[PDB]
UniProtKB/TrEMBL annotation, chains A, B:
Example of a GO MF term: pyridoxal kinase activity
The name this protein goes by in its record: pyridoxal kinase
E.C. number(s) listed in UniProt: 2.7.1.35
Any GO BP annotation: pyridoxal 5'-phosphate salvage
GO CC terms in record: cytosol
Family assignment from sequence similarity: Belongs to the pyridoxine kinase family.
Keywords: ATP-binding, Kinase, Nucleotide-binding, Transferase
Xref: Pfam families: Phos_pyr_kin
Domain Pyridoxamine kinase/Phosphomethylpyrimidine kinase: 99-250
Binding site for ATP: N140, K176, H208, G210, T215, G216, M240
Length: 277, 277
């Protein structure tokens, strides 16, 4: 408990649990004031026969942001969370949105934590430019492979990928999974500065067959929430646990029912060991 | 606990607690799957020096709805909740959105409850056409005065206003307040059909000086939630209590901090007597 304000910039769907709908409830459950910017407002996520809706233009984004800036809302965000954007100009514009906030915050001696979930064209080049400004990044193995140039097959390659992120400026790197078969392994790598020694942690979670929509979005939201007063390694463990229990709860590519299981999001009971290397 | 699906059609702001942001969290806290349609996506509510953002056009609404309809999402809403729309064509279109859902539901022998918060031009005429389809309406005194043609000054006039709503087809009418000075009085009036006797209830809540944004939006959301398994009179009492406690909690035109007080939304402790007349 402290300043729990988040600007969350992600997709929005009317039906299903992805993007800002998936992120906002877990955050609010943990006491966070979430200011949302919906980069798209669609009918649903991919998977269905049909998808429709509105996609935010650069003009619309800029215009929204005029109000947000003019009314001094930028000074009051302790966190920025980005998810699915898929627009070169806007992900390109977020570099600016981030930079306006950080300077506003630093001038009043308050902190800012930018958590970038690099959800993935020319969008890749734009992410390569944005990720260096992140305090925490949460790539899946595919996104880590694309950004770093290193195919993330296993722990060793995951570590080389994570080094790329530290080299471009990122302190905290979570590579959320890679697949001995009946488990998924993750890597957390932390390097608190150029002249700072890197420490790595790894752990596993049981693999469950099938696909589950919105897992990455809920993970990032829980990571933010748990990172507020838990050390990062503990926060990663609790986030992995939330997902592990939610994926099991829906076993009784389909939705996670987070709303049906709020105590799981608040207080996961499954223990995930995030073990130092 | 039962089918807790809601299609909620209201405004959305990035900053502040109004519209769909104000409604969605209380509903989710009570276990509801909320499918949101954001009729506008603005930077903030009225009150600030500047307001900016996007307003949904008829074309956009229709296009969104194509996806929602095509994917058979309409059949799975137990509730429809409407709030701030302010667009003749769209509030005009909601008549259709409502009618598609009701027939889909009736054909599978399931129920539908439409709660209309008639937030208020040519918009008035359009509401006069939409309100007859509502199961529950939640006008403030101004909106009851505008719709009915009767100035709602006191209990007697509130009752004549409520009669207008029953006459055009509405079973459950809540006139949320009118101002002996240190209290606000409300009226709940129920008439379960043309050939059904009207019953009325009234109660009071302590008046608190100042303005508080989003009270109507949170009230309607809590009413829906509490109406699910409580009788309506009890549900009105609990909703009035939630607001009464939230307005007191922010005393320690400014925001209600619902996220800071989730147990108040789930389990209000203040008792509001909804007394039969
Ligand atoms: N069967 C599963 N599918 C997806 N995620 C799982 C599964 N089982 C466990 N998880 C947990 O969910 C977390 C997020 O999964 P992943 O790394 O695939 O993100 P993602 O691919 O972005 O997910 P999504 O695309 O669904 O948002 C993983 O770190 C993992 O611990
Ligand atoms: N000082 C107050 N201001 C507003 N609402 C209050 C106040 N004190 C108690 N309330 C409760 O809040 C409920 C909603 O208020 P009201 O009927 O004014 O809706 P509204 O005018 O639509 O509010 P808003 O415009 O803020 O959404 C009332 O029924 C009342 O019981």
């Amino acid at each position: 408990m402290s300043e729990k304000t988040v600007l969350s910039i992600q997709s929005f769907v009317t039906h299903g649990y992805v993007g800002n709908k998936a992120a906002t409830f877990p955050l609010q459950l943990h006491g966070f004031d979430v200011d949302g910017i919906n980069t798209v407002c669609l009918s649903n996520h991919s998977g269905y026969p049909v998808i429709r809706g509105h996609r935010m233009s650069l003009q619309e984004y800029d215009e929204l942001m005029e109000g947000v800036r003019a009314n001094n809302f930028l000074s009051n965000y302790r966190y920025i969370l980005t998810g699915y954007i898929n627009n070169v100009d806007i992900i390109g514009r977020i570099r600016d949105t981030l930079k306006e906030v950080r300077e506003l915050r630093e001038k009043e001696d308050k902190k800012l934590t930018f958590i970038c979930d690099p959800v993935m064209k020319e969008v890749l080049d734009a992410y390569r430019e944005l990720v260096p400004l992140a305090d925490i990044v949460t790539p899946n193995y595919f996104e880590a492979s694309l950004l770093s140039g290193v195919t993330v097959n296993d722990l060793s390659s995951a570590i080389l990928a994570a080094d790329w992120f530290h080299n471009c400026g990122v302190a905290h790197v979570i590579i959320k999974s890679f697949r001995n078969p009946t488990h998924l392994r993750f890597l957390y790598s932390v390097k608190e500065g150029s002249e700072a020694a890197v420490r790595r942690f790894s752990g596993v979670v049981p693999y469950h067959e099938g696909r589950y929509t919105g897992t990455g979005d809920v993970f990032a939201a829980c990571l933010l929430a748990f990172s507020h007063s838990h050390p990062m390694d503990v926060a990663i463990g609790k986030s992995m646990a939330v997902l592990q229990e939610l994926i099991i709860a829906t076993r009784k590519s389909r939705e996670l029912r987070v709303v049906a299981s709020p105590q799981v999001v608040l207080q996961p009971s499954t223990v995930v060991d995030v073990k130092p290397i």
